[PDB]
Ligand binder design. Structure first.
Ligand code: MG
Ligand code: MG
Ligand code: MG
Ligand code: MG
Ligand code: MG
Ligand code: MG
Ligand code: MG
Ligand code: MG
Ligand code: MG
Ligand code: MG
Ligand code: MG
Ligand code: MG
Ligand code: MG
Ligand code: MG
Ligand code: MG
Ligand code: MG
Ligand code: MG
Ligand code: MG
Ligand code: MG
Ligand code: MG
Ligand code: MG
Ligand code: MG
Lengths: 149, 77
RNA sequence: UAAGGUGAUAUGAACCGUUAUAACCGGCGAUUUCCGAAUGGGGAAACCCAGUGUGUUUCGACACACUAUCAUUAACUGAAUCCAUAGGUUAAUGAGGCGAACCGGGGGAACUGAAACAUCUAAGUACCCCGAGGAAAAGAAAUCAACCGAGAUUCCCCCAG
RNA sequence: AGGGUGACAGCCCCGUACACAAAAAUGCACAUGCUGUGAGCUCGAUGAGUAGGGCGGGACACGUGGUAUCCUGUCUGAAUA
RNA sequence: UUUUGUAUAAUGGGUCAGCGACUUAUAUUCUGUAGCAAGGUUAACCGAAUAGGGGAGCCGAAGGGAAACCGAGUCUUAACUGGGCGUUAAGUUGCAGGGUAUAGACCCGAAACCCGGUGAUCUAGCCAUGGGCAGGUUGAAGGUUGGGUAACACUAACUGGAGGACCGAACCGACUAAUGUUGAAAAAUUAGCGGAUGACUUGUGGCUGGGGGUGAAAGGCCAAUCAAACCGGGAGAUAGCU
RNA sequence: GUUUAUUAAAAACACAGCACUGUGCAAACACGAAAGUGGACGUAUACGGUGUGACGCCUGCCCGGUGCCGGAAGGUUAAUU
RNA sequence: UGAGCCUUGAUGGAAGUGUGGACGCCAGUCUGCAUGGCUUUAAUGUUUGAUGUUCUAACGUUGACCCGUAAUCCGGGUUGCGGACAGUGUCUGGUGGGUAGUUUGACUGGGGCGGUCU
RNA sequence: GCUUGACUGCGAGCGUGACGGCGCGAGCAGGUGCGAAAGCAGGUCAUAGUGAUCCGGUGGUUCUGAAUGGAAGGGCCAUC
């Protein structure tokens, strides 16, 4: 008796996972209740892609955050006004929230999550390289520059 | 009747044939234990006198695949 | 079919017919009390008690008809429990019980023989029990053969005491 | 052939070979109507708690014997042209 | 008839008449007989059915060795000697008879064993529901009162009415003797006898079934039957006996 | 009181009393392949089995053998693997 | 708690100064806790058997309810109790005149006893 | 003193048995031992000291071996 676990099932259960066991455990508890089901081929074969429904069907279709590395990177001259502050410091506060949606007119809206700034960017004007953090692995190439009025 | 109900395993007859080859009519009774079966699909905790091994079938075929015949076979249940 | 008839012990009486249904013979129907599976309930078989209806009726009720059980099916109901089952009602069909042998199956003696008696034999016989048809059973090789081949089953004679 | 008639009858009587006969009712061959069956062809598929096995028995002429093969009550349990 | 032996006083027969026991089937072997002859003969079945067809097969013409094998030889043995068994035998197939085998096996006959049923209207317990027990006697426990005591004991009258109690009919039983013993009767009659309010007796119906029941236990009873009822069957049991 | 109906009525059986022993209730035990039932609509002051046989006085010694009870550490030991 | 397999120990990043175990050629010591500059046995996983625990979810309940149902049967449900025990099937050791089938010799100056039997 | 004839294969022909069996045996063949040799030796001076068959065990054998090759098993010999 193997059957496919359907929950915790203590020292063996793994949900959607099948493992050996005793007929006494099954058809008496593991099953009649809701914690398993026989391994009559279909119970697995008719579900072979059931796990691929995410590890495949719902894994490759997800490339929105990824496409940013190229799309949100093919931007022409990226710069955000940070209000100068007497040759050096600034007047405003330009950090992440800005370099993560400075595209409202283009309708290319986004969130303040996609940003490349571990710490607050001092009030300077250096090439604000605040890429898109939206995607973990393949981030993006989004920048900006401390400007003003 | 004392039948397997699921395999129709009834009690056969044989001989004790002890040492000295002494013949002594007897009979081999099955197992049977009337088990509590949860068809689930029918949402009924149906019960019926089965028998070891012959019960191992209810698992290899399916309480349903089993009752498939049985009931269809006319058997009450 | 035909000149005779009303079965027999049975005469007699009273009759029916002598051309074409007098009687008699075969086909097919009508009737077909009560008991009996016996089936509306019951019971010492051939008897006792009931329900619901009617042809009627002087409308007292006279009788007569249907009402067992189980199975399948259909419809309608319908508990613990929301549902859902179980249970219930009705209708429709079918069964039921007799049976001589033969046949398939379930269970299965002992006497006896062995010059005693356990293994062994009698014998899968006697017997009991369920089932089936005019036949039943069996039957189209996971069969044989022996390096050649045969080609389902069944029954006969050989093989062979 | 046989039977009867007051003793043994081919020709007395009933029959006998032979020749024919059915409104009807059915057994069974065919013949077809209706209901059901579904042929036919292409490409398929090809019988698992089964075969084997251990224990106890039963069937095979075959009394476990060196003992195949068959059924199994009981516990197991495969390959898959 | 049975016996060493019977007139035997040892068995069987009253008599008569009718009935009453070595058969039948298949096989095997002899003998007589017939056919054909190193050949003889078919079985089933077919069948213009006692024909004819069919030679599947059976027996015989070769035996020896445990066999492989060999062969008028072959085994035994190292033996190429001896010795054993064989070779100068007519067989086969019907028909009739003798004997044997298998069957009931000449006929009659057990005491029993096994299977399936029929019986508790007799009897043995028990269940439910009804009935019966003339008369006579004994007098327990309890109590009311008198006394009695510190109070209880205790006590005496009367009352009361117990009891597998007493005497004795019906009723139930059965100790003795006689008679009966082809009875009046397949267990009684007569004269006595025991119990007779009880573990009593009795009517009606009901339940226990055979290796089972029931039993105040004798192996008693279970329908005039009981160390395993009765009926039918196995079954023509078997019978070295009569 | 009971008993061999039909040769034995007794010194035989039964009895009240006694002792042993089992039985905690779904009791022990008995009928029954089982279900079920009796035991008992009872529950250890109860029920079964065995032996003795009112009552009075008593009921001595033997546990080696057989049986029953308790222990079971160790020796031997089945199917199973 | 034995049985084994896997891995990690003891035979075959620097001393020196406190504090464990491991049998012993001891003229032995080997191996661990503060400071100072591939054979024998032991743990962890692990699978397997053995004791004995607790759990519930088979299985039992001749506890109490409910419904079938104006039923101390039966069935389904609720709950309580018990619980992989009990019980049953196959196999298996013991016990087993409760039951059953049988055996239990012949000679013999009758049989038995005794004696005999080649 | 020396040895293993208590040898192996057979056996003319006889004795004794209902039968199964039991006994006597010159001589033959192969090899042995004792003796110079003639010869003697196939257990003991002789007559008791013993169990049929079955079922199996053990060694041998190219006898057989169920399609064929093997093998199990069967036969033959020896023997328990
Ligand atoms: Mg009626
Ligand atoms: Mg009726
Ligand atoms: Mg005999
Ligand atoms: Mg005389
Ligand atoms: Mg005389
Ligand atoms: Mg005469
Ligand atoms: Mg009195
Ligand atoms: Mg009196
Ligand atoms: Mg009198
Ligand atoms: Mg009566
Ligand atoms: Mg009588
Ligand atoms: Mg017979
Ligand atoms: Mg008296
Ligand atoms: Mg008497
Ligand atoms: Mg008397
Ligand atoms: Mg006494
Ligand atoms: Mg006394
Ligand atoms: Mg004493
Ligand atoms: Mg006996
Ligand atoms: Mg006998
Ligand atoms: Mg004698
Ligand atoms: Mg001597």
């Amino acid at each position: 008796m193997q059957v496919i676990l359907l929950d915790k099932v203590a020292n063996l259960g793994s949900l959607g996972d099948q493992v050996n066991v005793k007929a006494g455990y099954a058809r008496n508890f593991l099953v009649p209740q809701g914690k398993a089901v026989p391994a009559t081929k279909k119970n697995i074969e008719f579900f072979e892609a059931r796990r691929a429904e995410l590890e495949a069907k719902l894994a490759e279709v997800l490339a929105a955050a990824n496409a940013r590395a190229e799309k949100i990177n093919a931007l022409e001259t990226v710069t955000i006004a940070s209000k100068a502050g007497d040759e050096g410091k600034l007047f405003g506060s330009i950090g992440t929230r800005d370099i993560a949606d400075a595209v409202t007119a283009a309708g290319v809206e986004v969130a303040k999550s996609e940003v490349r700034l571990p710490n607050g960017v001092l009030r300077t004007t250096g090439e604000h390289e605040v890429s898109f953090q939206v995607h973990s692995e393949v981030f993006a190439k989004v920048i900006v520059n401390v400007v003003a009025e | 009747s004392r039948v397997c109900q699921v395999t129709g395993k009834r009690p056969v007859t044989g001989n004790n044939r002890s040492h000295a080859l002494n013949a002594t009519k007897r009979r081999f009774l099955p197992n049977l234990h009337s088990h509590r079966f949860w068809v689930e699909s029918e949402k009924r905790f149906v019960t019926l006198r089965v028998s070891a091994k012959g019960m191992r079938v209810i698992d290899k075929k399916g309480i349903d695949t089993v009752l498939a015949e049985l009931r269809a076979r006319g058997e009450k249940y």
